[PDB]
């Protein structure tokens, strides 16, 4: 479809790689696995 810009800390709707959601998209400093791109917490909610 389309390729837009990147929005810094501000309440904005997002569809990162086809992941519909709403929330502030801040920077993160957590190491990742080079086969997974998702992220969850104790409550099993998308976080990163």
């Amino acid at each position: 479809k389309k390729s837009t810009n990147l929005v810094k800390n501000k309440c904005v709707n997002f569809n990162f790689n086809g992941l519909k959601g709403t929330g502030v998209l801040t920077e993160s400093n957590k190491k990742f696995l080079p086969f997974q791109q998702f992220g969850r917490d104790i409550a099993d909610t998308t976080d990163a």
Binding site: L33, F35, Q36, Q37, F38, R40, A48
Partner: protein, 284 residues
């Protein structure tokens, strides 16, 4: 065309206990500093696995089954084990799958192969070490899938050093999707008897939408022939020291302790002994 092989020595299969082996990431989601309960297909803890050795000449090339996924471990030094065949009949009556790590590429073929009863592993090694003959199958009628990976060079030189390769693989086949998880490690100079203790997590590597049925699988070897191996096309050859362990997967509930970077530092079963069940139910 193919020929029946001879001069093989029969030995009963040995058994060895598995020490905390066969743990892989089950999904594509990253978690940090949690204790997650996953009900998936794993290798049961402290279950024992089948042992095969190759060096009489110890020609061990049997036909093992494929129930619900397979854990395959290999202690190796010079890439003796190369190829992997999967199928139901292996006589061109039904589709079959094949992975070959030959000199050209990593070839994956989903074809109606009329596999021989004893497919050779010719790899005729002159002063230089390449493959000169190919008698794995005879012909294919009309197949579906061919894939060739990135072309890379390979040595095949007859290295006869110490054991420094430990390769672990997990095979799954769910809903027509064939999945390979893997982990390769250089093992230190160590006594060559069995697989040491410790932990390791197998990152997912390959997913293929083959959509075929697999019931039986077989491994292949790399026989080397020189002036020291007199004989006809199926008598004189050299194999080299290597061993491989085979285990079968079962549906179990595990508890994995994700570390604070994202890797599985430890895992515990929930059906082995009452202490494990207590740990599972208390999530501690």
């Amino acid at each position: 065309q193919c020929v029946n092989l001879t001069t093989r020595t029969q030995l009963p299969p040995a058994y060895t206990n598995s020490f905390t082996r066969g743990v892989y990431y089950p999904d594509k989601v990253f978690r940090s500093s949690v204790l997650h309960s996953t009900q998936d297909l794993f290798l049961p803890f402290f279950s024992n696995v089948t042992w095969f050795h190759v060096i009489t000449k110890r020609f061990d090339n049997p036909v093992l089954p494929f129930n619900d996924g397979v854990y395959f471990a290999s202690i190796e030094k010079s890439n003796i084990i190369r190829g992997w065949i999967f199928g139901t009949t292996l006589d061109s009556k039904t589709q079959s799958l094949l992975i070959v790590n030959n000199a050209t590429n990593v070839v994956i073929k989903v074809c109606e192969f009329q596999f021989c009863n004893d497919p050779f592993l010719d790899h005729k090694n002159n002063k230089s070490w390449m493959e000169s003959e190919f008698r794995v199958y005879s012909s294919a009628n009309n197949c579906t899938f061919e894939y060739v990976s990135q072309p890379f060079l390979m040595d095949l030189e007859g290295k006869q050093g110490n054991f420094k390769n430990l390769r672990e693989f997990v095979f799954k086949n769910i809903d027509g999707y064939f999945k390979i998880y893997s982990k390769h490690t250089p093992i230190i100079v160590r006594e060559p008897e069995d697989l040491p203790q410790g932990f390791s997590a197998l990152e997912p590597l390959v997913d293929l939408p083959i959509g075929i049925n697999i019931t039986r699988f077989q491994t292949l070897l790399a026989l080397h022939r020189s002036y020291l191996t007199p004989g006809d096309s199926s008598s004189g050859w050299t194999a080299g020291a290597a061993a491989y362990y085979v285990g079968y997967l079962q549906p179990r509930t595990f508890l994995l302790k994700y570390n604070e970077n994202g890797t599985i530092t430890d895992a515990v079963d929930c059906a082995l002994d009452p202490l494990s069940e207590t740990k599972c139910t208390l999530k501690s």
